[model samples]
Target: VVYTDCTESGQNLCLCEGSNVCGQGNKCILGRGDSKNQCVTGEGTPKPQSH
Candidate 1:
């Protein structure tokens, strides 16, 4: 999970990714439930991409 604080005095705001997660300029919050960014599911094998 991630929570962001605006740094630009309301001018710069955190941007949410398509996966409902926040990225650069934002702070990532740790939680027990599902991650807001959903960046990982654990250290597992990497799946092959079709493209």
Candidate 2:
């Protein structure tokens, strides 16, 4: 379901629901660095577990 647009438009972007808005295998969560939330995925987070 890679329909979300977590590509070049997520920073400073807040939303109540992200999974349906954030894609690229990335999840929608509030930013720890800033109060604002957006779509993000770290080195081992963006991608799913290798299981």
The per-residue C-alpha lDDT of model 1 at residue 44 equals 22
Clash statistics: count for each candidate? 0, 0
What candidate 1 gets wrong by more than 4 Å, as runs, is 1-18, 31-51
Model 1 agreement with the true structure over 1-51: per-residue lDDT tens digits: 334432221111233234343333444333345543323333222122223
lDDT of 2 by residue, 1-51 (tens): 323222333322223144443434454554456644555563212423224
Native-to-model Cα distance after best TM-score fit, residue 27 in candidate 1, in Å: 1.1
Q: lDDT (CA) for every model shown?
A: 0.31, 0.38
List the pairs of residues colliding in candidate 2: none
lDDT at position 12, candidate 2: 20
